[PDB]
Design a binder for this molecule. Sequence first.
Ligand SMILES: [Zn+2]
Length: 134
Amino acid sequence: MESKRNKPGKATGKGKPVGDKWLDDAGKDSGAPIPDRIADKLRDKEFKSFDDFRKAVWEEVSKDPELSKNLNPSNKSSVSKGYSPFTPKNQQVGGRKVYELHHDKPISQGGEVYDMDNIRVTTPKRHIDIHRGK
Ligand SMILES: [Zn+2]
């Protein structure tokens, strides 16, 4: 059966205060946190799937001047439509070229799918290292 990340749910969690260079943390240790201002927009909203949630995250990033400041024109256009933005080329891996959402406590260990304190923003390079080649 497919992963439970495909089932509907409501967003929970507080997120964390970040600065305008927040995505520079995505390629570090446990990636960057969901910003507290994004969590304040999405908490209690119902989503159809984790991919639906991901789209809402980037849409809210596009509407926050501070969080979207350092995105280039193409990436600003991507996030306004709910698409994940490209990371710097040195943090891409093969066909995986955009920021990825990672569950800190894995869903396989009971981690919650839509808990914004359990979701990190990572680069492809960092995320494939975290899961040892997957
Ligand atoms: Zn992960």
